Design a protein around this ligand. Structure first.
Ligand SMILES: O=c1ccn([C@@H]2O[C@H](CO)[C@@H](O)C2(F)F)c(=O)[nH]1
Ligand SMILES: O=c1ccn([C@@H]2O[C@H](CO)[C@@H](O)C2(F)F)c(=O)[nH]1
Ligand SMILES: O=c1ccn([C@@H]2O[C@H](CO)[C@@H](O)C2(F)F)c(=O)[nH]1
Ligand SMILES: O=c1ccn([C@@H]2O[C@H](CO)[C@@H](O)C2(F)F)c(=O)[nH]1
Ligand SMILES: [Zn+2]
Ligand SMILES: [Zn+2]
Ligand SMILES: [Zn+2]
Ligand SMILES: [Zn+2]
Lengths: 133, 133, 131, 131
């Protein structure tokens, strides 16, 4: 079922918290990006001594997937060690809008099983696109 | 009046379109960031041969203002040569959320006088903050 | 410095796989670990140009996400008359994860190449030591 | 290379002005134009670390937004035992707007300094030539 699959994706994103490279913030974030073909891509945040070159977990998952030729995504899970479900930052929301349909579901996870259901469009309303370039 | 001030800010953002450094996209964006003290900061997008080091007009305005000690913002105008009012990208929305109140008004401008009224919260719902760091 | 044709092939083959709808300027990377495992990178652009990710960083983000921490070589290729140059942001990510002396091979069109290292590309590198 | 105390003062004074609630690691910059006009930079962090902007880039974004295109010197200061090092991203922005030979002065605590140039900090610099 869709709910049982979502729990395996949640597990993938939560396990990513243990793989994060965060020696400066000590704030791990995990992601599970799911393709239309069923393949999952796990993302971690990856920091840099120069903070601005840090890459978020959500973007790591997209860059992994897109590098393998993936262009059709059906779900994204993001997890954090947070009392409420973790929130993707605006930069990640913009990468999500580049590759995903507006109505693609996004599940946000925090500690102690808390979750929030949303979509790409709800996280980034009136999204900037390539339309006018 | 608030509406007459908003038109001077709109003019500032539109004039910024002529100052943009966009030799690669040729897509200028202008910004007018207004402080509680009445001071305005004009932003332009500034590209780099390595595209990822490009800085948006909205962020240029914030970096100018914050570098002068500004921490209290009351309005942001963003303008583009676009048929509908220009949309700030997610990265800019995240910088807006760092420094602005959720309900701070944002005016988006396109060509031929088209405008859209919104706020920091509406552009970036459920915003990620420093709360859990 | 050792240079395997597989590594060159990995970086050049990536040129056809890049996500570059805005620049049409593909960049390819092959990042090699101590075990010999290879990670291919492509540049991945965004309608907001400043969210673009370079091929070199894509390769590092892939490898680091799989737990790799020991790198022995990086090949970078472009469709360029001289060997392609990694940008400064990529050089800083390379310095995060690689030894100063780790070899780097830069490739352009028609077989032009240039051999260098992490330290030569980023002298007097900024590190975390004073944070 | 000419070095004015005003420029050093501008970069060091910026250390007290930085927006660094996450690292508490301030960086200051003084960017000088041909006309002698100076632009002060600070690093400006973000709760999402990857949206942080460096002091060097803040100075360039300020100057370029005011129409400046001719730069003659960059001073960068940190509270560091050795002169602070610009990160690779900053070096790439410097290469966008500065001559290869434009002088750069790096400053640390207790008056330690190091003189360099844009080209020495970013050898074999990537440019727009093949786009
Ligand atoms: O959307 C987001 C927002 C933040 N993070 C990570 O939080 C830490 C502190 O910023 C950094 O390592 C990070 F990369 F920004 C994500 O992974 N995704
Ligand atoms: O929010 C935004 C989104 C895009 N832009 C600019 O559009 C051009 C094409 O991406 C680039 O120069 C730019 F910087 F990204 C902004 O200025 N602000
Ligand atoms: O070091 C580098 C420098 C540039 N590129 C790519 O060139 C295009 C134009 O900037 C963008 O798509 C890109 F990502 F920045 C790399 O992949 N690596
Ligand atoms: O070149 C550089 C390298 C780092 N910094 C600043 O150091 C802190 C920790 O990375 C961040 O606040 C910062 F912005 F990246 C600069 O200002 N310039
Ligand atoms: Zn993010
Ligand atoms: Zn933006
Ligand atoms: Zn790069
Ligand atoms: Zn920097």
């Amino acid at each position: 079922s869709m709910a049982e699959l979502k729990q395996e994706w949640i597990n993938t994103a939560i396990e990513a918290l243990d793989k994060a490279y965060v020696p400066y913030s000590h704030f791990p974030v995990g992601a599970c990006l799911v393709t239309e073909s069923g393949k999952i891509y796990q993302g971690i945040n990856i920091e840099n001594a120069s903070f601005g070159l840090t890459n978020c977990a959500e973007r790591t998952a997209f860059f992994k997937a897109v590098s393998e030729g993936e262009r059709s995504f059906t779900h994204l899970v993001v997890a954090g060690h947070t009392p409420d479900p973790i929130s993707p930052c605006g930069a990640c929301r913009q990468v999500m809008a580049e590759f995903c349909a507006p109505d693609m579901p996004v599940t946000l996870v925090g500690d102690n099983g808390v979750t929030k259901a949303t979509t790409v469009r709800e996280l980034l309303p009136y999204a900037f696109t390539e339309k006018d370039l």
